[PDB]
Paper text:
To gain detailed insights into the State 1 and 2 conformations of active KRASG13D, including the Switch regions, we solved high-resolution crystal structures of [name]-bound KRASG13D and KRASG13D in complex with RAF1 RBD at 1.2 Å and 2.0 Å, respectively. The electron density associated with [name], magnesium, and switch regions was unambiguous in the high-resolution maps. In the [name]-bound KRASG13D structure, Switch I is in State 1, since it moves away from the [name], and T35 does not contact the Mg2+ ion. Methyl and 31P NMR spectra of active KRASG13D in solution confirm a two-state ensemble interconverting on the millisecond timescale, with a major Pγ atom peak corresponding to the dominant State 1 conformation and a secondary peak indicating an intermediate state different from the known State 2 conformation recognized by RAS effectors. The refinement protocol fixed the major conformer to the State 1 conformation (represented by the [name]-bound KRASG13D crystal structure), as indicated by the 31P spectra. We calculated RDC-refined structures of the [name]-bound KRASG13D starting from the corresponding crystal structures (State 1 conformation) and allowing a maximum 3 Å displacement of the heavy atom coordinates under simulated annealing using all experimental RDC restraints. The pairwise RMSDs between these and the ground state (i.e., the starting crystal structure) are between 1.0 and 1.3 Å (with no significant displacements of the switch regions ). In the [name]-bound KRASG13D, a consistent deviation between the ground state and the excited state can be observed in the allosteric lobe, which has not been previously reported due to the lower resolution of the solved structures. In the RDC restrained model, the slight departures of β5 and β6 strands of the excited state relative to the ground state result in a displaced α4 helix away from the ground state (crystal structure) position.
RAS proteins are small GTPases, cycling between the GTP-bound form (active) and the GDP-bound form (inactive). RAS proteins are the central node in signaling pathways controlling cell proliferation, survival, and differentiation through interactions with various effectors, such as RAF, PI3K, and others. [name], one of the three RAS isoforms ([name], HRAS, NRAS), is the most frequently mutated RAS protein in cancer patients, and G12, G13, and Q61 are three hot spots among the oncogenic mutations. For example, the [name] [name] mutant (KRASG13D), which has a reduced oncogenic phenotype compared to G12D, was found to favor State 1 conformation (with the switch I region open).
Residue numbers in the entry: 0 to 169
The structure:
């Protein structure tokens, strides 16, 4: 009888989709190869005093899996749209992910958070102002994260749940 939220993590290869999810679930970062390409996780959390169960779908982002993207997305209630701040192509891809989500959910109003990951790095190619303005143009929150240091990780997922809760009031 507990409220469940279905989250889907999307973004280009190597942006840190899995690392962010593993930090949320296991509270660690380990840079090691893992051959799985489709993983569902369940985590019970308390957000604003309300307990819920997150079902988090984390799939590999390489283009060779692109035919499955819409089918994974179609299961989601909310989307963590991740790019890496040192990967300009991953930021350019965000527009196409947003368009695909809108198409799959048949709506211009879909719970979504833009995540700029790898903020621990000493260099970056994507300016924070550019990402903030993009998020504003979509009407979604923007959060900078590091799966390595854990900065912003809880805030990214919890903000997404808050976005779903607000959407369900409509
Ligand atoms: N410095 C730093 N490295 C990170 C961060 N997040 C992930 N990485 C590293 O970047 C690489 C890709 O991370 P991974 O979580 O596998 O990314 P993914 O988005 O799930 N890739 P795929 O689409 O192939 O499943 C790994 O070497 C990982 O350790 C971060 O916040 N900071
Ligand atoms: Mg990979
Ligand atoms: Mg992954
Ligand atoms: Mg640093
Ligand atoms: Mg909005």
């Amino acid at each position: 009888g507990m409220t469940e939220y279905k989250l889907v993590v999307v973004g280009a290869g190597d942006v840190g989709k899995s690392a962010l999810t593993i930090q949320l679930i296991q509270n660690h970062f380990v840079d090691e190869y893992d051959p799985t390409i489709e993983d569902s996780y369940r985590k019970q959390v308390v957000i604003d005093g309300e307990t819920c169960l997150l079902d988090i779908l984390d799939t590999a982002g390489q283009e060779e899996y692109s035919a499955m993207r819409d089918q994974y997305m179609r299961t989601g209630e909310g989307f963590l749209c991740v790019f890496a701040i040192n990967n300009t192509k991953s930021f350019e891809d965000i527009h196409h992910y947003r368009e695909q989500i809108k198409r799959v959910k048949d709506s211009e109003d879909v719970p979504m958070v833009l995540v700029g990951n790898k903020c621990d790095l000493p260099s970056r190619t994507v300016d924070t102002k550019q990402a903030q303005d993009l998020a504003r143009s979509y009407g979604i929150p923007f959060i900078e994260t590091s799966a390595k240091t854990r900065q912003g990780v809880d805030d990214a997922f919890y903000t997404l749940v808050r976005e779903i809760r607000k959407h369900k009031e409509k």
